[PDB]
Every structure is written in structure tokens, then in C-alpha cells.
Amino acid sequence: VGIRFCQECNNMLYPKEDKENRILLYACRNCDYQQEADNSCIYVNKITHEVDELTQIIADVSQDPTLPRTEDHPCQKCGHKEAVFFQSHSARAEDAMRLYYVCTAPHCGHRWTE
Amino acid sequence: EEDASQLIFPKEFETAETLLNSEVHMLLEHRKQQNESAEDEQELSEVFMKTLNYTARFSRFKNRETIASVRSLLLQKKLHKFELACLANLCPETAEESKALIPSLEGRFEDEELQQILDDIQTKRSFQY
């Protein structure tokens, strides 16, 4: 799923398979340098793409004045009552309706979902 | 007894193929070039000069490549030859304008597909500035 660059020309390392050693190794085309891949995975594709939005939410949204703030749900690792919450901004998840909470502390930046 | 809106006109013109205003300028230029230098003849008639200005002023295309591309693009469709030059010469801004100006198009062209054709002409026609 990831992308790796060779050390010679810093170019794409397309997946290549050798018939002698029977091992998949990421080999560059223009440069003869080739490196083995330990993941043994070329790529993945989530058709439903149900990726958690917590990683996508940025911690710097605490200072946003427009975003609503509710004290009902406190931060897990802080205890601060104030917590800013909002709905998913991703168009893919627009069909679903959910709330994501972020700690209002200046430096915590913790994101969690109930 | 003839009407352009109803696609009725003398049968002789059916065999003729329409030409664009910009394209005609090229043909006039070819005629102008040979007369000016190739042969020593009388100066070109005032009619030739008058239409040359009209074609140049209303020329919607710069070079032959742009003219050929539009001609080829419109040839793929079932556009009638009379509409071929008339649409390109008019350069309607939108599909609605073309149908009102050209009643024939609205008979066999939908409001969506024709719009995808006029906008293509817009990308081909260029401005001096």
C-alpha cells in the first residue's frame, strides 16, 4: 500500500517477481538497484472505504470559535469538561451521521468518538 | 418557395458542401495570392474585396488545424451540411441559442448533447487578444 524510493535515483519501485528465488522484490527500472519487500503486500483497496475519521481530524480545531462546544463529554486523558464536537467533513461519510469530539486543552489534541 | 428554417432549397445546392467564413478566407487568400503575383491580370473585383473583409472580420479560427478539427468533430455527428457551416459561423454561446437560431437542430438534437458540441467550438475559436 505504501511507496518506497530507491537510493540511487529516487524513483518509483514497481513490484517485480523473480522466477529463480521466488521472492517478490521492489526493483527500479531505470537503475539496476533492487530491494526486497518484507511486507509481501502490493496494495490494498477498501471499496466501502470505512476509514476511521479520527486520524483525519486535526487537533488545531480546538480554537475554532464556530465549532460548537459541549461540556457533557470530557477528554479521556485530561478531565477537562469543555470539548469541541462536530460532524464528519468527508463527503464519503456524508451518508452516515456521527459526532467526533476533540479536547479543548491548548496542547492535548486528543480525538475520540462515542 | 424555399426556406432555410425548414431545410427547403433548390436541389442543386444539395451536392454542394458548405464552407466556413474563416475557411473561405483561406480560399480567397489562395485566389488573391496567385492573381497578385502568379499572373499579370486586372485587379480583383470589388466583390472579391468586400467578401474578404467580411470573412476576415468574422473569422472564428486562426489556422487550418483549428478549422479542420471543428469540421472533423462535427462530421462525426448526423449534423446536416447546411447546419455544419451555419453553426460554426454563428458560434452559438449555448444550446438554447442555437436551436432558436437554427430550428433544424432542435428536431434531432437534445438540449444536452448539442451543448457538449457548442462548448467544443468555443475551445477551438480563439481571440486575437
Partner: protein, 151 residues
């Protein structure tokens, strides 16, 4: 109705709401909220019709059926109703908020254009703009309707 809408919003916020098999969660929520607001206008409007006395001039016009309609009286006395745009509620022109005053990702009655004030009482500043948006659609539709129908 306003409290009921909040309850529906809370259910969807907590994921308690279950979408119908024939619709998705986002569309299902819009349907449930619309019925609550639509039902309130009809129920309140119907009560307004019974409110008018025989001597009342508003009742005389509608009773005879000459001019006006029961809906017009409802918007004058009881409530104007929801201001739908393009067949739906007011869209989020800004980022997830209909107007700057409303908080982000607000799906409440006032935020989405529900007009709870009758013409006689007077609309709030937010409602006036939402009312204009609904009226603008009608004028545009009316302008094109005559052109197409005449053709």
C-alpha cells in the same frame, strides 16, 4: 415540534436512529424532520381555520372558495412553514452551516430554514433570508414555467 426535531437529531447524533431499508441515513433523517415540521404547519393551520369566527372576513373568503386558500391563512396566523429550496431544506451555503450565525453542522429548525413565525407576528432576521430563498425559487420557476407552457 421543535423539541421533537431535537430528539430526532439527538438519535441520529448518537447513532440510535435506524435508516429505513428503502433509504439512507442522511436522507432518512431529512424525511423524519420534514414530516414533523410539515405536520405542525398543517395541525396549527387547521386549528387557525377553526379559530376564525363566522363574522371573520378571512373565513368568509375561504369558506366561499372565491379567493385565497386555507394555507394562506395558516401562513398569516399560525405559521409560515418550512422554506424548501430545490425540493429540500435550506442548503449549507457555507461550510456545513446555512448562515454564519448558526453553529457549524447545525440541522436545527431555525438553522435549516424552518419559519415558526407567522406573517402577522413577524419573522426573525434569519427567517427573512430563508423566506427570500424559498420565494426566489418560486419566481424563477414561475418565470420559466410561463415560457415553457406557452411553447
Amino acid at each position: 415540534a421543535k423539541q421533537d426535531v431535537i430528539e430526532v437529531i439527538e438519535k441520529a447524533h448518537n447513532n440510535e436512529l435506524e435508516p429505513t431499508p428503502g433509504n439512507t441515513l442522511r436522507q432518512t433523517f431529512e424525511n423524519q424532520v420534514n414530516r414533523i415540521l410539515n405536520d405542525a404547519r398543517d395541525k396549527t393551520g387547521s386549528s387557525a381555520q377553526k379559530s376564525l369566527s363566522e363574522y371573520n372576513n378571512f373565513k368568509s373568503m375561504v369558506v366561499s372558495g372565491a379567493k385565497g386558500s386555507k394555507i394562506n391563512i395558516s401562513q398569516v396566523i399560525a405559521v409560515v412553514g418550512q422554506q424548501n429550496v430545490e425540493g429540500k431544506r435550506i442548503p449549507f451555503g457555507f461550510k456545513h452551516r446555512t448562515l454564519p450565525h448558526f453553529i457549524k453542522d447545525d440541522y436545527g429548525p431555525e438553522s435549516r430554514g424552518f419559519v415558526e413565525n407567522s406573517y402577522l407576528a413577524g419573522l426573525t432576521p434569519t427567517e427573512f433570508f430563508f423566506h427570500a430563498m424559498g420565494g426566489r425559487e418560486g419566481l424563477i420557476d414561475t418565470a420559466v414555467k410561463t415560457a415553457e407552457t406557452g411553447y
